[PDB]
Paper text:
NADPH oxidases (NOX) are transmembrane proteins, widely spread in eukaryotes and prokaryotes, that produce reactive oxygen species (ROS). The cytosolic dehydrogenase (DH) domain belongs to the Ferredoxin NADP +Reductase (FNR) family which has motifs to bind a flavin cofactor and a pyridine dinucleotide NAD(P)H. Thus, the NOX core catalytic domain contains the necessary machinery to move electrons from the electron donor – NADPH – through the flavin and heme cofactors to the ultimate electron acceptor, molecular oxygen, to make the ROS product. Here, we obtained X-ray structures of WT and F397W mutant of DH-only, and of a F397W mutant of full-length SpNOX.
To solve the SpNOXDH WT structure, we used the SpNOXDH F397W structure as a model, and achieved 2.5 Å resolution. Phe in this position, however, leaves more space in this pocket and the sidechain has more degrees of freedom, making it feasible for the nicotinamide to displace it and transfer hydride to the isoalloxazine. With the exception of possible polar contact of the first phosphate group with the backbone of the protein, the rest of the FAD molecule points out into the solvent, in the direction of the missing TM domain. From these observations, WT SpNOXDH could well behave as a flavin reductase, able to use different flavins as substrate through the sole recognition of the isoalloxazine ring. In contrast, the SpNOXDH retains constant affinity equal to that of lumiflavin (~10 μM) regardless of the flavin analog. These results suggest that the isolated DH domain binds to FAD primarily at the isoalloxazine ring of the cofactor, and the addition of ribitol (riboflavin), phosphate groups (FMN), and adenosine nucleotide (FAD) do not further interact significantly with the isolated DH domain.
Numbering used by the authors: 179 to 399
Write the structure that this text describes.
């Protein structure tokens, strides 16, 4: 307990409904905030009609006094977020958490995202406009209407040729599968999506390419 730490006080400045069920929150904080792309944080909302309990969400962009989250409806709080959350509202955050720093991974990196699991990588893309690493990125989503940030990703491919982008619509091709997929020899694979999808892909990637490093963060929708 050798540090006195105060929560990060914030105001919500902008919101955008990216699709039918996912909403992007832009926050201004009272003082600069440390994180590294791939970490999450615990957000507490103070608006009439909202529970103020802390929910974790992956940080999906920002530096300094700007922080972004992208929320997919999955239950009542998130549904309330999509529907009713309002610019002006006060929020606090404790601090960054997680062991998924994309910076610290190898030169070579494979990225796998299922659904709203793309958020941590949007973080990376947003804060590294020119890309240093070598990236194969697999974005899996259930139907075009569950994809987000498409334009941002395509713009990023155009600016960064060392950025290689695969869009899988799982309803077209079936769940992503890495059995007959090879992996760069000295690569780090990062993954984020439904827990069910993580565990299945971990299995497939530790067996085919058992020499690969693999960091993931699951959740349930
Ligand atoms: C590290 C991490 C990062 C994350 N990042 C993100 C992110 O970037 N974006 C994002 O949208 N989410 C993210 N999540 C998930 C998010 O934290 C939760 O999904 C969210 O806080 C749930 O809030 P809720 O009240 O809407 O869900 P709840 O209503 O609490 O329920 C959650 C789930 O449980 C089920 N459920 C609800 N009520 C009941 C009941 N009475 N009985 C049985 N089952 C029930 C629902 O089907 C629902 O899907 C992350 C989670 C983790 C752990
Ligand atoms: Cl799951």
């Amino acid at each position: 307990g050798s540090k006195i730490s105060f929560p990060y006080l914030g105001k919500i400045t902008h919101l955008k409904r990216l699709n039918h069920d996912t909403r992007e929150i832009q926050i201004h904080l009272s003082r600069p905030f440390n994180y590294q792309s791939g970490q999450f944080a615990f957000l507490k909302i103070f608006q009439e009609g909202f529970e103020s309990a802390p929910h974790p969400f992956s940080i999906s962009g920002g530096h300094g006094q700007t922080l972004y989250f992208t929320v997919k409806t999955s239950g009542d709080h998130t549904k309330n977020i999509y529907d009713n959350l309002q610019a002006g509202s006060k929020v606090t955050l404790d601090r960054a958490y997680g062991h998924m720093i994309i910076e610290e991974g190898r030169e070579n990196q494979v990225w796998i995202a299922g659904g709203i699991g793309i958020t941590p990588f949007i973080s990376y893309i947003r804060e590294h406009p020119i890309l240093d690493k070598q990236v194969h990125f697999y974005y899996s989503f259930r139907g075009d209407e569950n994809a987000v940030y498409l334009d941002l990703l395509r713009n990023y491919a155009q600016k960064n040729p060392n950025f290689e982008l695969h869009l899988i619509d799982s309803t077209k091709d079936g769940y992503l599968n890495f059995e007959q997929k090879e992996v760069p020899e000295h690569a780090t694979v990062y993954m984020c999506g439904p827990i069910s999808m993580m565990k299945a892909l971990a299995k497939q990637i530790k067996k085919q390419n058992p020499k690969t490093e693999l960091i993931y963060e699951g959740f349930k929708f």
